[PDB]
Write a protein that binds this ligand. Structure first.
Ligand SMILES: NC(=[NH2+])NCCC[C@H](N)C(=O)O
Length: 229
């Protein structure tokens, strides 16, 4: 069983892409930290095992999970019907939606995806933001592995906008006063922890930890920890 494999090796293998503050990011000490890293530590601790974070490209997470290189994905991942075809998700643990970020020193203030037609828009490959902008034939989409590359591209004027999730948009804009979020929230997404569909033992265990975190007040402590910059 899944729990048995974890306990046999002595550590939980968690996949994520650490370019997504405040969920998983590289801090001033060069350490991977964040809200999701803390969720990962709670799950591992409650299993009686150590934690191993496996950092990788975002679009590699699902295939890493299906190919059994990781036990679980905790990486700011939106629950979607398409992804539910191939993995299972925990109870939702956060709400977000896509927003559009542009340079402040420009007249351009897009409010919808249709406002991006005729523009060049940077996205992280494989995300819900990529999926949505990709629907609009007149958007010139530039896809990146890391949001740090997408913001560099935006800041230097090579792209007109970046489309990404609300909370991480706000985290990036807080550090970049040359940027602004021009749109409201364009989707209604929830984050989930992804596990293989056959690993219902692990899934149930993760749901129990989530429910306990909320009941105990520790979830609100974690929110305060990561959303009070
Ligand atoms: N750690 C990350 N880069 N996460 C990107 C998540 C973006 C979006 N919520 C999605 O599931 O597509």
């Amino acid at each position: 069983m899944a729990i048995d494999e974890i306990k046999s090796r002595g550590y939980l293998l968690v996949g994520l892409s650490a370019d997504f503050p405040p969920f998983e990011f590289v801090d001033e000490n060069g350490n991977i930290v964040g809200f999701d890293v803390d969720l990962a530590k709670e799950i591992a601790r409650r299993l009686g095992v150590e934690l191993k974070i496996v950092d990788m490209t975002f679009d590699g997470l699902i295939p890493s999970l299906l190919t059994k290189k990781i036990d679980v994905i905790i990486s700011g991942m939106t629950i979607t019907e398409e992804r539910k075809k191939v993995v299972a998700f925990s109870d939702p643990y956060f709400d977000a939606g896509q927003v559009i970020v542009v340079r402040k020193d420009s007249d351009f203030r897009p409010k919808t995806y249709e406002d991006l037609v005729g523009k060049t828009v940077a996205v992280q490959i494989g995300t819900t933001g990529d999926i949505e902008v990709s629907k609009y034939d007149g958007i010139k989409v530039v896809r990146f592995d890391k949001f740090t590359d997408a913001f560099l591209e935006l800041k230097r004027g090579r792209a007109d906008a970046v489309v990404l999730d609300s909370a991480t948009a706000r985290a990036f804009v807080a550090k970049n006063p040359d940027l602004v979020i021009s749109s409201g929230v364009l989707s209604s997404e929830q984050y989930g922890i992804a596990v293989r569909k056959e690993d219902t033992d692990l899934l149930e265990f993760i749901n129990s930890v989530l429910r306990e975190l909320k009941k105990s007040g520790k979830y609100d402590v974690l929110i305060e920890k990561w959303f009070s910059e």
